[PDB]
Amino acid sequence: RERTVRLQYGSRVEAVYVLGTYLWTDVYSAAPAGAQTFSLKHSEHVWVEVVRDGEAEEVATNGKQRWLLSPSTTLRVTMSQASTEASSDKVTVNYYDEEGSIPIDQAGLFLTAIEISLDVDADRDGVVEKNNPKKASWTWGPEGQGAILLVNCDRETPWLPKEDCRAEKVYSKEDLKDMSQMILRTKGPDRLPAGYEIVLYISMSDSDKVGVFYVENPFFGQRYIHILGRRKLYHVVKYTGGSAELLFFVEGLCFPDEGFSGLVSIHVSLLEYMAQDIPLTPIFTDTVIFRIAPWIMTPNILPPVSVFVCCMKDNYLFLKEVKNLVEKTNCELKVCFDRWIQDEIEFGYIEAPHKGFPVVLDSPRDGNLKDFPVKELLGPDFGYVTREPLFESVTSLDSFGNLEVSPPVTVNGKTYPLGRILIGSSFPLSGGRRMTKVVRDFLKAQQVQAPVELYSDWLTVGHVDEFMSFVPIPGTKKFLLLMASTSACYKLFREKQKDGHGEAIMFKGLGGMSSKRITINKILSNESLVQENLYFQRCLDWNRDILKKELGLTEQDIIDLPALFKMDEDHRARAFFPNMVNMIVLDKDLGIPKPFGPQVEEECCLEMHVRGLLEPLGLECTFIDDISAYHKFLGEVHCGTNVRRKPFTFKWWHMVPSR
Amino acid sequence: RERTVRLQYGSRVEAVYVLGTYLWTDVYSAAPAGAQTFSLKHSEHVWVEVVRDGEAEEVATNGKQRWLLSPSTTLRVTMSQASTEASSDKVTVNYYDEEGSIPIDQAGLFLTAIEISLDVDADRDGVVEKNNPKKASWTWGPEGQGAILLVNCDRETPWLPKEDCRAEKVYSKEDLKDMSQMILRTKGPDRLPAGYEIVLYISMSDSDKVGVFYVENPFFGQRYIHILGRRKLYHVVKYTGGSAELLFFVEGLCFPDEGFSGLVSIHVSLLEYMAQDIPLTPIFTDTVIFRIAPWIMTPNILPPVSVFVCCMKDNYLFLKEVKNLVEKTNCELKVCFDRWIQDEIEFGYIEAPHKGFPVVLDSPRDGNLKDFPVKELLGPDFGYVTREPLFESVTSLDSFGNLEVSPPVTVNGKTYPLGRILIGSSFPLSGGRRMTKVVRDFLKAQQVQAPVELYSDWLTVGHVDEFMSFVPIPGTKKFLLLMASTSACYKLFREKQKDGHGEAIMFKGLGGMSSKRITINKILSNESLVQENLYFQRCLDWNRDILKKELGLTEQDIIDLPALFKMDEDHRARAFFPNMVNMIVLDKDLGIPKPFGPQVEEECCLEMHVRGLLEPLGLECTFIDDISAYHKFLGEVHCGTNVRRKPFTFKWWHMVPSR
Ligand SMILES: [Ca+2]
Ligand SMILES: [Ca+2]
Numbered sequence A, B: 001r002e003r004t005v006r007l008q009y010g011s012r013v014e015a016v017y018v019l020g021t022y023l024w025t026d027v028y029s030a031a032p033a034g035a036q037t038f039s040l041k042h043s044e045h046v047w048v049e050v051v052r053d054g055e056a057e058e059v060a061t062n063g064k065q066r067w068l069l070s071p072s073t074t075l076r077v078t079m080s081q082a083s084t085e086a087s088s089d090k091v092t093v094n095y096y097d098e099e100g101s102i103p104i105d106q107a108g109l110f111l112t113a114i115e116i117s118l119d120v121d122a123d124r125d126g127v128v129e130k131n132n133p134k135k136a137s138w139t140w141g142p143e144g145q146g147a148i149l150l151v152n153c154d155r156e157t158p159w160l161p162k163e164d165c166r167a168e169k170v171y172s173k174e175d176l177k178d179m180s181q182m183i184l185r186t187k188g189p190d191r192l193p194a195g196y197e198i199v200l201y202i203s204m205s206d207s208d209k210v211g212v213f214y215v216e217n218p219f220f221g222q223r224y225i226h227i228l229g230r231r232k233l234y235h236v237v238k239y240t241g242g243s244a245e246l247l248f249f250v251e252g253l254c255f256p257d258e259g260f261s262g263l264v265s266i267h268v269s270l271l272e273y274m275a276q277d278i279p280l281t282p283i284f285t286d287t288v289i290f291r292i293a294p295w296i297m298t299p300n301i302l303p304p305v306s307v308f309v310c311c312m313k314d315n316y317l318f319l320k321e322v323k324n325l326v327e328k329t330n331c332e333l334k335v336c337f338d339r340w341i342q343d344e345i346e347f348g349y350i351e352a353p354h355k356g357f358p359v360v361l362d363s364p365r366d367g368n369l370k371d372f373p374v375k376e377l378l379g380p381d382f383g384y385v386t387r388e389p390l391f392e393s394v395t396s397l398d399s400f401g402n403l404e405v406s407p408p409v410t411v412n413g414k415t416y417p418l419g420r421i422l423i424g425s426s427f428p429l430s431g432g433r434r435m436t437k438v439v440r441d442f443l444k445a446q447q448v449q450a451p452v453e454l455y456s457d458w459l460t461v462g463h464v465d466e467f468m469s470f471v472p473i474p475g476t477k478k479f480l481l482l483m484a485s486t487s488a489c490y491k492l493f494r495e496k497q498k499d500g501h502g503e504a505i506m507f508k509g510l511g512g513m514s515s516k517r518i519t520i521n522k523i524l525s526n527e528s529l530v531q532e533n534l535y536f537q538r539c540l541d542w543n544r545d546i547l548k549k550e551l552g553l554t555e556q557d558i559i560d561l562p563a564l565f566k567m568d569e570d571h572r573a574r575a576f577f578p579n580m581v582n583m584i585v586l587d588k589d590l591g592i593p594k595p596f597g598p599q600v601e602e603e604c605c606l607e608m609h610v611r612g613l614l615e616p617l618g619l620e621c622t623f624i625d626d627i628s629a630y631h632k633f634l635g636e637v638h639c640g641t642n643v644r645r646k647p648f649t650f651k652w653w654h655m656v657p658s659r
């Protein structure tokens, strides 16, 4: 950086020189009238070049050498080390008229060199390197750089109930591990020259995105001074001489969102005082950039950690069968004593090079079924985030049964290493339901999961989790998409009827269904029901095509599971028997809703068919009965499970998202 | 594109096949119970493959060949040409049980193949190519593609006073040349099969960004039907058989801005009717993208076309000297009978491959000096755009004396082929004036001029045009930055004093200045005035450094012109004599404000000094006296000029802007 510092007519100018810059110095404007030539002297630690029309020549500390005064002949002044002061650092210029060799005047420059660098971990190893030249920008990819910041959305202690980022005060030390370090490094003499001060600052816009603290170590214990953030745009820094470092901790307050890219800036400036009523001049400015880490979801293929379950305390079969399934795995089971864990919560995570933790997204309140957020999962290294609409009404499509994510896929050459978020919607011209804009905008803004809308609005409840899921193929790195299929169910029932099983009864053991006496015959002879399910198969097939296109899937990647629906008064589908596709996936072990299908030789023909599809792949199937405690099935699921998974090993900052 | 079309149990399914796709067909779900094998027949124009577990085999129009029924054995159905109908296009599947060779059932697929393509000029040559595969995205650069749209911001006829884009009706044909062509091309039989329709549509969000018209040629003359736009989100298209083209014209209503990237989408879908109360299914969708052309400014280096001048009718010297200067060039002079042409107007332009026109940006009204926009320049191929603040007060920094643009520059390897917009501001921590956000946001959103803020708030008026300008170097492709310099003025005056000229009088011939009797001596002996101008030189030097950094300039690229200011009660600068830097640049010819400096041998020493700087470069200087009609100079300029220039030859869409 070239900085302009010109000599002043018959005067000695004092300036602070910041290392990493250099000065160009006009000696011509300061020459007395009549002056012809000049000479110069300079101290040991100052490098001085005489530059005439672009060509430079170094000059000795004291030469008697004289040059022609001229506007195009200037000085270039460089220093490579900070002033000890001690430290006479100066350049002095003498002026001579035509006749006689004694100087007729003098102008001088007295310099104090200091180092000022605001440093962050831009190279993303968890340590703050000295003056990364790339610290002022942020680039994606394995070769990309720039510092990363977590939203500090967890809670260190229950005493103050809100997320840590909702306070301008730090009430606990462990909080510091969630933040990103920023160090102001300076080197110089005992004091700054008269008229200077160093100031940290942020823009008004960024002031609600971040907060910045300094940890003071005064007499009575460590304390955290909040120096930038909400309603603090600048902080005057106390200068310390010699080599000094000031450590700051930065917290994010906000996830990327509509109107906020995720990028924020912090600045330090050396300011020079001019006079009263005149603003201070920013002599030098150094900038660092942070990108706030996005909220990221976990597909079913990722290793399970915890299985969260909610049910009534008397659903014994459900609890026993889930407990047993989990015991086949290394997962922990957590139970709460009714679908809220599935519908109201999506477990995601955030990560930065220095740390990461899981973060819950909380579905919006409708003012009917949900009047209150679920914050009870908020805790140490378990974060919380939510979005609520302003004018928009919430519908069933805002439930997180309607929010899922694919395994990593490659589509037309483009890799999506974190998978793609999937949410259900209605056709553009339909006037149907859609997830609220506020939530859709939030998911889109995270960018690294590139969301895709599917068609869920043909279902009464309207959730993608009703019709599709993903499972790993054991012993490989591959996965399958599972799709509900009504055509598969009809084909199976028709075969069983042909086989002499037409009188086989659905719903065995649900006493509340017995008087209906539903048989394969009864189902197959219902003409309107056939027509309803042909239509529902068209709806499923429309989704199949979107999934194949947007996930880069072929028919080889898909298995169809038998399903059946009944149309409601809105021309929307509700499950006729439990939807087996919505299943608990713990690696090779699958908890599958028990269908209560027609019994043939005392086994459910739906269970046997599903085992015949999945078991050859090495998938182990356990059928879980959540409904027999209720004595009947109306199309509604009363129990819920949500699996918290390990994050992807692929770092999100190694992705390169579309512009 | 693979599309799912499955056979229906014991039924003949009718489907429209859109060319460019192909179908995968399940024959297994439609097989009767007990069926073992199947055979198939197909017509001439249908290609059918039997696919077992991913391996495909083509099958003859009628073979007697039988395959094992199985879920993993399916059909793949392809058509390469549209149905004439005429046209029996079908695939028929026969089912057989174990014992006996006569078919026990049949399922069939009756197909009507059509071509549907929505086409735009994506390759940017001005003609609409057939089905550019890149038409659904927009990329920058010489190899980039996607279609470009102009904001139709001019006015075809004065009858309806507003810009054309502010009406949902087309009142003149010439308007069509401003728009972009979009053609829906279809090929098929005489009619679509029962239950289908073709619909064009746009999103609600995009509905205020565009409008789309069809030109009907009915009995009484051509007319323009507005089929998409404000409060029209969709249009049902009338299908024509054979090969048909429907021509549409698209207009932009909005420039890129805060919250609007400039990109918009138009869709066509083939919809299938299901039943009453059930939304129509989008069987096929084709999408085109338009990017709306940005508003672009012109630096002083570009060829001049028209010089616009405003003054009082009695300023004779000004008019005579401007007229004469322009006569040295090929420019036209336009005069209006007071700085509004300079302050209230910035001439820009827009361009698309099919056409471009100049466009005026109109400075915001303050409710004091400007209560009304200047729309009188609005006309055929002269466009208009404006931005007004909502809650923000307008200040002097919103005048377009404060809005300029650099010549093309390269900075740290990055080329800015259109130059960089320059606007004056105040320091971040100063609490000073700044251009309104609404205007700043607009300029930033155009993206191709990557704006830079300079420091203008040390000036009373506060405009970058007060202290800096650019001139070409004649006979070369290079340019210089000119900077006001107070140090240069003092050096010159000190030399003249030494030379015996101290009693030389400023402002000769302005009788309203005579009693002040201002001389070189009087100026040089004023101590406080020296201090004021030393400070003003620091302000100029701060800008010099920003310009060098952000424009990639060295000292070799800069010439300093003498200037002098007087500090006001706000500690801000007003010109002591006319600022010579704010000059009319017509290629090698420069109209320079006449300074009225001290006379030495009956020539102004400021004029002679400026000629000595510029003339060796081949620049011709004409000094223009706008003030003698007023008899005095108070620091205010009463006349204004604005030069309308030819656009850059470099196409804006060939740039690659930062992410
Ligand atoms: Ca590091
Ligand atoms: Ca915390």
Ligand SMILES: [Ca+2]
Pocket (backbone or CB within 6 Å): A154, A156, A174, A175, A177, A178, A380, A381
């Ligand atoms: Ca923590």
Ligand SMILES: [Ca+2]
Pocket (backbone or CB within 6 Å): A342, A346, A400, A401, A402, A403, A404
């Ligand atoms: Ca979910």
Ligand SMILES: [Ca+2]
Pocket (backbone or CB within 6 Å): B120, B121, B122, B123, B124, B125, B126, B127, B128, B129
């Ligand atoms: Ca073309």
Ligand SMILES: [Ca+2]
Pocket (backbone or CB within 6 Å): B152, B153, B154, B155, B156, B164, B174, B175, B178
């Ligand atoms: Ca027009």
Ligand SMILES: [Ca+2]
Pocket (backbone or CB within 6 Å): B154, B156, B174, B175, B177, B178, B380, B381
């Ligand atoms: Ca026009």
Ligand SMILES: [Ca+2]
Pocket (backbone or CB within 6 Å): B342, B346, B400, B401, B402, B403, B404
């Ligand atoms: Ca201007």
